């Protein structure tokens, strides 16, 4: 399971704080957290490239694709860039575009692919981040 | 750059700047769409990301083909296949002469095919209007401009209501009841269908409430015997002026019996009872359908 290399990111402290911040799962839904893994494999990220910045740009790309409510995903900017995020997010978005280029613009992830990558380990808590109303 | 040079500018709007470019040496014409980057970030707009990502997995004879994406740090070009003109300019060019019914039937047929392909692949276009429909010299019409398009396979996603110019916006969206799906695209084609016959917009409103009012006078003011949950809708008002439904030749005179039938089905108030593209393709209004050549 390639997923192991996906799951190390969710043991990180500041990451877990980012999840805890997103109670309503507005930007960190289980489907979004599945799409970012899809992005990881589509970009053919090595174990080396499983950085925190790559997780955030992939998550942001996922929100850009599947979420019409455009403003909530801006909450990602501080966690990835710090307190100086208001002057660091254009470069962050440039990195997102680079990732989008790297995956040959296949940013669309069908539900089937999401259910397949959520089926490898249904035990993990990130898949119980259901969203309702 | 490469082989191709810009030969003339087609249009310039909020989407960006679309050029007509051609190749010497071989003779290939393409539509070169320059994307306007974001102001604060100089990054690719969400609409461009969605359009490219969707069109890259959508290949259909009734859908515009994305040929290549020129991606540089400062510029972003979208290479599309070239078609002669959009449907709106064709309707304005035929406004006095009229468009032959076999050609109308042909266009609607192909549009319903392409729309069915999008819906089967869990993709909403959400922006079906004549200027986003491209035609060629050999009788083919294709869906274009997937900037406001998106997939709807993944559950509980957030949606928007700024979908299409009011004229072709379904009444479900106008009443603020969001949770909408495929039906809204069908509604747009229904409006476009009428606009192909009379060469005149069916619901030409200037506001949401005006758009609703024109839809009401044309199709009758909705009750709960036709639309089960219309009175409990967010933007519904009891002060709505009640109009009776009009007869469909006082609405569109040149249609035939099967014509009024299909148009009546595509403009159903209830989204759950509104026809799908697939079921519309099997309607008794596409029996003698053929592919006539338009005079451009």
UniProtKB/Swiss-Prot annotation, chain A:
Disulfide bonds: none annotated. Transmembrane segments: none annotated. Residues 1-132 are annotated as: Speedy/Ringo box. It is found in: Nucleus. Highly expressed in testis. Expressed at a low level in wide range of tissues including bone marrow, brain, heart, kidney, colon, liver, placenta, spleen, skeletal muscle, salivary gland, thyroid gland, thymus, trachea and uterus. Expressed at a slightly higher level in adrenal gland, cerebellum, small intestine, lung, prostate and trachea. Expression is cell cycle-dependent, being restricted to cells in G1/S phase. It comes from the Eukaryota. Interacts with CDK1. Interacts with CDK2. May interact with CDKN1B/KIP1. Identified in a complex with CDK2 and CDKN1B/KIP1, where it interacts primarily with CDK2. Belongs to the Speedy/Ringo family. The C-terminus is required for CDK2-activation, but not CDK2-binding. Regulates the G1/S phase transition of the cell cycle by binding and activating CDK1 and CDK2. Contributes to CDK2 activation without promoting CDK2 phosphorylation, by inducing a conformation change of the CDK2 T-loop that obstructs the substrate-binding cleft prior to kinase activation. Mediates cell survival during the DNA damage process through activation of CDK2. This is Speedy protein A.
UniProtKB/Swiss-Prot annotation, chain B:
Its EC number is 2.7.11.22. GO terms for molecular function: ATP binding; cyclin binding; cyclin-dependent protein kinase activity; cyclin-dependent protein serine/threonine kinase activity; magnesium ion binding; protein domain specific binding; protein serine kinase activity; protein serine/threonine kinase activity. It catalyses: L-seryl-[protein] + ATP = O-phospho-L-seryl-[protein] + ADP + H(+); L-threonyl-[protein] + ATP = O-phospho-L-threonyl-[protein] + ADP + H(+). Keywords: Acetylation, ATP-binding, Cell cycle, Cell division, Cytoplasm, Cytoskeleton, DNA damage, DNA repair, Endosome, Kinase, Magnesium, Meiosis, Metal-binding, Mitosis, Nucleotide-binding, Nucleus, Phosphoprotein, S-nitrosylation, Serine/threonine-protein kinase, Transferase. Found in a complex with CABLES1, CCNA1 and CCNE1. Interacts with CABLES1. Interacts with UHRF2. Part of a complex consisting of UHRF2, CDK2 and CCNE1. Interacts with the Speedy/Ringo proteins SPDYA and SPDYC. Interaction with SPDYA promotes kinase activation via a conformation change that alleviates obstruction of the substrate-binding cleft by the T-loop. Found in a complex with both SPDYA and CDKN1B/KIP1. Binds to RB1 and CDK7. It comes from Homo sapiens. This is Cyclin-dependent kinase 2. It is found in: Cytoplasm, Cytoskeleton, Microtubule organizing center, Centrosome; Nucleus, Cajal body; Cytoplasm; Endosome.
